[PDB]
């Protein structure tokens, strides 16, 4: 259909050969002469203040070339994919477990760990917030600024207070999705160095090399054109590699030692430090009529974005806009609030808050289909989006809409294979 020269065809990928031959090099596969190894000394508490930090004994180890804290940063010390609330190295205070406090560079991996076990630190723990409830309490201690309210969106389409009176059926239920981690098979790894021509470079497992460049250049106060980021062959990301991982820590050390700095996270540290999916809770109420046509959807959701924003602003926004499934709803009300907590940093994970939202609306639909003796597919085909329909945002679908086809073709296939 629509005869194409190469499009559609199953061509051998341009990078598969080196992957099956084993010559392909992922970040951790890179090695350079005089290359030093790096490790990060992190927090063991979730919320506190650093009263005392001693790095003297670490530095005194024969083989350790450097041990640094935020003072060592010549440029800025605030980063973030959207909101600059993430430090490279804690300066302000610890806001989570595994927060980056200091970084070490040594001749061998063991010397790294030796230098790490020699560092001592004293904390002045604060109230670690772990529930959205306690986080909303105007009483709770602000993890950021003077409030624990990160994002707040409100979508109002038509008039739901009215429509909820033209419905012969109305279902209400509270939905909740948990916390998950990308679990890409390749742990976070990177290597920074000044190349032969003096170019500060970072080879790394990432999903956005250019974003990484800005942050590094910012940290070192260098124009972007003078910082090179090479996205090495990457072993999966699924969203967990959009935030900074080792880029700044490696670069920072290469900046001070002028030598290549390799940092390869163990599975444990990789999972402990990377972002996680936003665990959400969604209060929903959908009203429909006999025939099955939806009349109004109302949602009030909350989100635990964690110690730092990360993709939180984008998660809440995308969630708010999709919470009312791929169906035509003339009336929509949405209240969403994301809060900062001391729980693992929540960010981007395949779906951007839509998987969580899908459970909520699909749970409602299947609920209405059960209360109206309709086939879960038909009740959907009926309210399914089509070219010409109007979205809760006032946008009108003008092209590419094959939702009903995915419903029919799918059901059909199901029948043929599972007896629908």
């Amino acid at each position: 259909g629509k005869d194409y020269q190469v499009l559609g065809k199953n061509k051998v990928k341009v990078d598969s050969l080196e992957k099956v031959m084993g010559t392909a090099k992922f970040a951790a596969d890179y090695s350079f002469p005089d290359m030093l190894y790096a490790g990060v000394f992190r927090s063991t508490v979730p919320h506190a203040r650093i009263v005392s930090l001693d790095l003297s004994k670490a530095r005194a180890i024969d083989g350790v070339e450097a041990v640094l804290d935020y003072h060592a940063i010549p440029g800025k010390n605030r980063f973030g994919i959207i909101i600059k609330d993430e430090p490279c190295l804690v300066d302000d205070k610890v806001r989570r477990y595994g927060d980056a406090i200091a970084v070490v560079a040594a001749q061998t991996p063991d010397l790294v760990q030796e230098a790490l076990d020699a560092i001592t630190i004293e904390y002045e723990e604060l109230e670690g917030i772990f529930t959205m409830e306690r986080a909303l309490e105007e009483d709770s201690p602000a993890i950021h600024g003077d409030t624990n309210i990160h994002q707040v969106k409100h979508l109002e389409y038509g008039d739901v207070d009215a429509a909820f009176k033209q419905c012969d059926i109305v279902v209400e239920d509270t939905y909740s999705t948990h916390r998950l981690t990308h679990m890409f098979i390749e742990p976070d790894a990177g290597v920074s160095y000044y190349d032969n021509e003096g170019m500060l470079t970072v080879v790394v497992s990432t999903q956005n090399p250019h974003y990484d460049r800005g942050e590094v250049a910012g940290m070192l106060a260098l124009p972007n054109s003078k910082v090179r980021i090479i996205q090495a062959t990457t072993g999966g990301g699924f969203g967990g590699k959009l935030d900074l991982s080792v880029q700044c820590h490696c670069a920072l050390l290469t900046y001070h030692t002028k030598k290549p700095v390799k940092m390869v996270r163990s599975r444990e540290e990789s999972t402990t430090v990377s972002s996680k999916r936003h665990p959400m809770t969604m209060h929903c109420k959908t009203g429909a009529t006999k025939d099955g046509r939806l009349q109004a959807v109302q949602v009030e959701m909350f989100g635990d974005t964690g110690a730092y924003a990360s993709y939180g602003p984008a998660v809440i926004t995308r969630a708010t806009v999709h919470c009312m499934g791929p169906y035509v709803v003339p009336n929509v009300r949405v209240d969403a609030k994301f809060v900062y907590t001391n729980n693992p940093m929540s960010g981007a994970f395949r779906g951007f808050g839509v998987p969580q939202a899908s459970v909520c609306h699909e749970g409602q639909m299947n609920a209405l289909a059960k209360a109206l003796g309709m086939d879960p597919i038909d009740i959907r085909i009926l309210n399914a989006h089509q070219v010409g329909a109007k979205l809760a945002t006032g946008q009108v679908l003008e092209n590419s809409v094959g939702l009903i086809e995915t419903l029919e073709k799918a059901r059909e296939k199901a029948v043929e294979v599972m007896g629908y």
């Binding site: 990078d15 598969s16 992957k19 031959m21 992922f26 098979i185 390749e186």
Partner: protein, 157 residues
Amino acid sequence: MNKITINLNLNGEARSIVTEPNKRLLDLLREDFGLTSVKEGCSEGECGACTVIFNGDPVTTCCMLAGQADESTIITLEGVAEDGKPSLLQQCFLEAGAVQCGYCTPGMILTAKALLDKNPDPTDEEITVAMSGNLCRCTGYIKIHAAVRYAVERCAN
């Protein structure tokens, strides 16, 4: 601690190295022999990414001490290629779409090769259980299996 002498047959050739024993077989292969096809995805024997053919049998090198590779025959992904060219198995993985991020690929191929080197005509089930020691987060395993089934069929001829 005294350095130990290790003799083994790595990728078709007799090698021998004197080194400290305080390291894993995975480290020995990656660092001492430069075989970086052997990945380290978890450090606890779960992902299988560090799989290598240890005496006709696949094993997790992250669970073995360098010295244990003495008197053994080891084959890593680099040893699969035939005079620099993709073997049949490797070719099938290429055409089948069994490769996404490619981090698990080395182990997968080695497990599938270890199998096929013992059972040329395996059952889809024998294929599944055979590679159940290797985890992939990209493919869903579907197309990886297809590549193995693909190889076996072309093996008939």
